[PDB]
Structures are given as C-alpha cells and as structure tokens.
Design a protein around this ligand. Sequence first.
Ligand SMILES: CCc1ncc(CNC)s1
Length: 185
Amino acid sequence: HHHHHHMVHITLDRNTANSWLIISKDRRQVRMGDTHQNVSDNKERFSNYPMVLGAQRFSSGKMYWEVDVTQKEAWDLGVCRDSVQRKGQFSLSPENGFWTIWLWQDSYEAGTSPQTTLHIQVPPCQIGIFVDYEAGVVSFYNITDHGSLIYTFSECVFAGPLRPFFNVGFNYSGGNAAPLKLCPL
Ligand SMILES: CCc1ncc(CNC)s1
C-alpha cells in the first residue's frame, strides 16, 4: 500500500482506560497491570474489558497509524465512534460503533456480526490501520508481510467522530502481558 504519507501521531487517553491499564509517560504504550492502578472511576472508563481510546478525534480526511503486537496472544485494534458504550458487556461490531480486528486463540478475525475469519500466513508483529472518513473505509495491513492487506471494512456508516481503539486483552494465561505500542513514523 501507499497510505504511509497519511501517518498521524496517536497518543492514548488515560481518562478512557480501564482502571487496570498502565499507559507509559509518552502515552504511546499500554499494558495490563497485575492490579487496579489506583485511579478514580469516571463515566469514560471501559469497565468490563482492558480497553483504551486514542486522544485524537477524526471527522474527515485520511489517517494511518501502526501498532506493535509482538508476542501477544490476544488483542483487539481498530477505530470506534466517540460515543460507544463504556460500561457493561457488549460485542465489537459496526452496529455498536466499532471497526476492529482481533487475535484470539491462535486465530485472527474481523469484528463483523457475525465475525469473519481472516487468512494470515505470516503472524503480524505490527499492524497498519488506514481510515478514509469520506469514503467510509477502514483497512488493516500486515507490516511484517510487506504491508499485505488483512481486511477492508467498506460502506462504513461512522455516524460520528472516530477515535483509535485498543484492547490489550486479558492475561489469564500468563502469556499475554506484553504491551501494545504505537510505532514511530
Ligand atoms: C476489566 C478489569 C479487570 N479485572 C481483572 C483483571 C485481571 N485479569 C487479567 S482486568
């Protein structure tokens, strides 16, 4: 792909984070803590899952960023509406305001309803995410495999400002402690 020139500097919004997440001082890395991280509760925090939003809001244009997923067993990445539900249980789907892919139990899937099997021959260490607001497109690229396409959501009905979306996943296994990292331009 040739989307690299739409690169945007994404930073994480502490105030949206689940209370067990640890966000680095530069706001470019997030990982699961082994306990509550001693923050006050607020209506923005994702309560049920280890999720956090980027600070940036997009309502136009073309945007591209990259995320490092090295050695993780489970994660969700993509974009979501600024107004997605924060509390209680919910599915990641466009009907609920999410445009996401994930890794879970050694398989990759796109967050459609129902979910779609992805075909990845080279497990990615870094994922590229491309958003074209006007076109209604969210695309995912395998940086480890020369930028090969993973998945395109088209005909997207964003219906609001978009925010970068992250889930570090649970760490029940002891094999999923590694962080998500926003990679340099
Ligand atoms: C969603 C908040 C959490 N409660 C317990 C957690 C620890 N499990 C890996 S994370």
